[PDB]
């Protein structure tokens, strides 16, 4: 957070 991680 605040950015999110990819799968």
């Amino acid at each position, epitope marked *: *957070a*605040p950015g*999110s*991680t990819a*799968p």
Partner: single-chain antibody
Amino acid sequence: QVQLQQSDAELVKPGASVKISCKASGYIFADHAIHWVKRKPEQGLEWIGYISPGNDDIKYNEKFKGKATLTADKSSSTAYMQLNSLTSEDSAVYFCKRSLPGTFDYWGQGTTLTVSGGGGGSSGSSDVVMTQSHKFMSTSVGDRVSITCKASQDVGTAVAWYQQKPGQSPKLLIYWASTRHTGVPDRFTGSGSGTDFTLTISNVQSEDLADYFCQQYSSYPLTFGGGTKLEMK
């Protein structure tokens, strides 16, 4: 076709445990974390934790460590929250929801827990506090409404706004301080950065009378404002 279907209302004795389920459908279960949120009647939302089933990452709000346990069953695409050692202070509506605020935001319908001193957790002195100055606000149809949220520290632009109507789940309006979520009417705008954030409703309508909540997702634990109930003058 995205769905988060929670289990039925629970009525238990102090000292018991409960396990609330959140069945996910219509997307790849592994590709999004499921968060859990506690709502007490008339009172603010609190973030419990997330489970990220794709990488088995679990993160708790320190306040709920020793009270909540999150698991996920990939075989059933179901997330579970077990609450242990229950007291009246645990009586609330619990939501599961998908992802951080942004395009994948989606909420379960909520599960009411009803439980038939000072053993609950406390917030950290380090946690961000989100202050909505007005718990109640009055307007007239066609007026401009401004709802403000002050953060206790710089949260950059990682702020969201939610609407909630009685018996319904929160609905994302704004994220990244100023970005309107898909489907939200043009009249809802967001502004702000650092410590000051505002949701503006231009040309307000009767369908807009509801509770509004800000949330910061700058840092864990994720924290919500106390809410503003917007009503008719």
